[PDB]
Amino acid sequence: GKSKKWKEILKFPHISQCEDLRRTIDRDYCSLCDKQPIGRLLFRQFCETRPGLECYIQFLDSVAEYEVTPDEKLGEKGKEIMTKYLTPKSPVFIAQVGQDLVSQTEEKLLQKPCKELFSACAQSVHEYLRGEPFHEYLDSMFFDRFLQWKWLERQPVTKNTFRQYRVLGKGGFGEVCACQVRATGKMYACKRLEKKRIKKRKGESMALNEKQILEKVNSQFVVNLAYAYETKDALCLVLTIMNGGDLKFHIYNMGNPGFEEERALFYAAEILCGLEDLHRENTVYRNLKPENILLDDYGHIRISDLGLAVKIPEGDLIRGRVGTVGYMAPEVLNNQRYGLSPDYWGLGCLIYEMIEGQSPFRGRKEKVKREEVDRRVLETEEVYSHKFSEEAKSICKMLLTKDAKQRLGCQEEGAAEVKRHPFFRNMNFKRLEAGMLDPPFVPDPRAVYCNLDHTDDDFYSKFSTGSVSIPWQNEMIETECFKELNVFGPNGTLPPDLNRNHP
Numbered sequence: 459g460k461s462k463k464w465k466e467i468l469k470f471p472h473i474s475q476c477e478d479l480r481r482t483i484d485r486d487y488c489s490l491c492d493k494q495p496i497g498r499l500l501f502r503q504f505c506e507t508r509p510g511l512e513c514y515i516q517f518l519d520s521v522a523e524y525e526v527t528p529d530e531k532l533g534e535k536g537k538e539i540m541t542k543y544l545t546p547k548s549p550v551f552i553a554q555v556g557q558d559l560v561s562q563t564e565e566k567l568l569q570k571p572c573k574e575l576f577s578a579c580a581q582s583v584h585e586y587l588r589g590e591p592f593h594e595y596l597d598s599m600f601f602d603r604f605l606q607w608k609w610l611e612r613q614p615v616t617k618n619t620f621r622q623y624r625v626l627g628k629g630g631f632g633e634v635c636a637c638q639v640r641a642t643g644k645m646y647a648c649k650r651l652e653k654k655r656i657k658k659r660k661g662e663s664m665a666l667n668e669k670q671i672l673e674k675v676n677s678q679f680v681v682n683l684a685y686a687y688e689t690k691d692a693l694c695l696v697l698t699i700m701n702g703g704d705l706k707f708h709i710y711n712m713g714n715p716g717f718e719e720e721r722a723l724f725y726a727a728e729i730l731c732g733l734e735d736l737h738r739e740n741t742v743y744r745n746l747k748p749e750n751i752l753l754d755d756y757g758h759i760r761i762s763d764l765g766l767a768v769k770i771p772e773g774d775l776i777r778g779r780v781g782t783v784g785y786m787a788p789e790v791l792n793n794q795r796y797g798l799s800p801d802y803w804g805l806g807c808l809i810y811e812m813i814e815g816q817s818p819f820r821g822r823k824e825k826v827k828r829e830e831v832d833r834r835v836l837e838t839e840e841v842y843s844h845k846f847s848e849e850a851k852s853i854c855k856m857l858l859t860k861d862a863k864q865r866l867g868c869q870e871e872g873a874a875e876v877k878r879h880p881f882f883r884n885m886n887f888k889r890l891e892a893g894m895l896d897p898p899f900v901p902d903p904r905a906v907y908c909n910l911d912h913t914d915d916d917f918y919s920k921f922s923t924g925s926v927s928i929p930w931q932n933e934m935i936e937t938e939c940f941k942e943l944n945v946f947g948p949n950g951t952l953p954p955d956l957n958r959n960h961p
C-alpha cells in the first residue's frame with residue numbers, strides 16, 4: 459500500500475546534490491559492494507556491463523549455492539562449478555584465480571567433499587574485484603546512482619514518514635504500536651517511549667543504550683532497528699514486526715505443554731545464532747525467557763526486548779543483578795562480575811523449558827516463593843525425563859553449569875562450541891542462517907494470539923539519528939521501490955538525473 463505519490467517522495471535527487479556525500483563516504487569495498495544491500499546490487503549491476511567481470515559474479519553466486527547444498531549432493535554441485543568456471547577452455551573461466559590455486563581445488567574434489575571447498579577461490583575472486591573493478595565502479599554511473607540512494611537514506615524521518623495503525627503490545631516506559639512507511643508500504647512495530655516518563659525515572663542512558671545496540675546488530679534472529687525519531691511527547695523505535703506470537707504462548711497454549719525435541723532444536727538453533735550475532739559486538743542480552751522470543755509470519759523467531767542488553771567493553775566484566783526471577787544465572791543472582799555467560803544459562807533454561815514444558819527450577823504446577831526458586835538455581839541440580847535424548851540432556855546441563863567458567867559457550871571459542879555440541883548434530887547451520895530450513899510451525903496470517911530544559915535537547919540529538927542504513931536499503935528492495943526506481947537511459951546510456959550537463 460504505497461502512497462499515491464511514493465515516486466515523488468523517493469524521487470532521485472540530481473547527481474549534483476550528492477557532491478558532499480561523494481567526499482565523505484568512506485570507499486570501503488566490503489561496505490559499498492557487499493554489506494550495504496543497494497551498494498551490492500549496484501556493484502553487481504556494474505559487473506553485468508563488463509564482459510570479463512560478469513563471470514566473477516556468477517561464480518560467487520554458485521559458491522553461495524554450494525555452501526548450502528546438502529551433503530549427499532555436495533560433490534555433485536562441486537564439479538558442476540568446476541566444469542563451468544575452473545576449466546581453462548570455458549567461456550566463463552575464472553582467470554585471476556591462478557593455475558596454482560585451481561589445481562588444488564581439483565584434488566579436493568578427487569577426495570571427499572566439504573562445504574568450504576571453494577572458499578580459497580572465492581577470496582582470490584574478491585581480492586581481484588577489490589582492485590581495478592571496484593575503482594572502475596567508483597567512476598561509473600552505478601556509483602553515482604548509489605550516492606543518490608544514500609541521499610534518500612539520509613533524508614529526515616518525521617511522524618509523517620509513518621502511519622500508526624493499532625496498539626499491538628505493551629510494556630514498561632510506553633507501548634508498542636504497528637506502523638507503516640507511507641512511501642514503501644512496509645509494516646513495522648513502533649516502540650513509543652513517553653518522554654515525560656523517561657526524564658522522571660531518569661532512564662535516559664538505558665533508552666540510548668538499547669537504541670545504539672539495535673542499530674549496530676543486524677541479525678536474522680534479533681529484532682532490527684530501521685528508524686529512530688523523536689516526536690511530541692515520545693521517542694520512537696521502528697522495529698521488526700512479529701505477528702506469529704511469542705514462544706511462551708506456543709509452549710503452554712499450543713504445546714503439550716512443550717515441543718518435540720526436534721521442534722525445540724529448531725528454535726534453539728535460531729536463538730543460538732541470535733546470541734552469536736549479539737556476542738559478535740560483545741553485547742550480553744541478559745533477558746532470555748520464552749515471552750521474549752517472538753515468531754514472524756513464516757515461523758522463524760527473533761530475540762526481542764533488548765532493554766536489558768549492554769555492550770561489554772572488550773576484556774572487561776560488568777556487574778548487574780537484573781532480569782526475571784527464574785531466568786537469572788547464578789553469577790547474576792550473586793551479583794558478581796560476569797560477561798556473556800548469562801546468555802548461555804538462559805539458552806539452557808529455554809531448551810529445557812521448550813522440551814519439558816516447565817521451568818527446570820520451578821514446576822509448572824508448583825507454588826514456591828521467589829527465594830526458594832533462587833536457592834534451586836544456586837544449589838539444586840535439575841532432573842531430566844525421557845522427553846530429552848541423551849544429547850539434549852548433555853547440552854542443557856552443560857549450559858546450566860553453575861560455575862560460569864565450566865559452562866558451555868563461555869570459553870574463548872564462544873558460540874561455535876555450542877553449535878558443535880551433539881545436540882545440533884543433525885543441524886546444518888549454514889542452511890539455517892540462509893533460511894532454507896522449513897520452520898516446524900507456520901502461523902496463520904489472520905491469527906490472533908494476544909520540561910523545557912536544554913539537557914533534554916542534547917539527549918534527543920544522539921537518539922533521533924534517523925534511518926538505519928542496512929535495514930533502510932533492505933526495505934527499499936523488499937517493497938520493490940528499488941527495482942522500480944533504479945532505471946537508467948535506454949541502451950546503457952546516462953539518464954537525465956545522472957547527467958551534469960542539464961539539471
Ligand SMILES: Cc1[nH]c(/C=C2\C(=O)Nc3ccc(C(=O)N[C@H](C)c4ccc(F)cc4)cc32)c(C)c1NC(=O)[C@@H](O)c1ccco1
Pocket residue numbers: 626627628629630631632633634636647649650681697698699700701702703704752762763764765905906907908
Ligand atoms: C505484532 C506484534 N508485535 C509485537 C511486539 C514486538 C515486535 O513485533 N517487535 C518487537 C521488538 C521489541 C519489543 C519489546 O521491546 N517488548 C518489550 C516487552 C517492551 C518494552 C517496552 C515497551 F514499551 C513495550 C514492550 C516488542 C516487539 C507484539 C506484542 C505484537 N502483537 C501480536 O503479536 C499479537 O497481537 C498477534 C498479531 C498477530 C497474531 O497475534
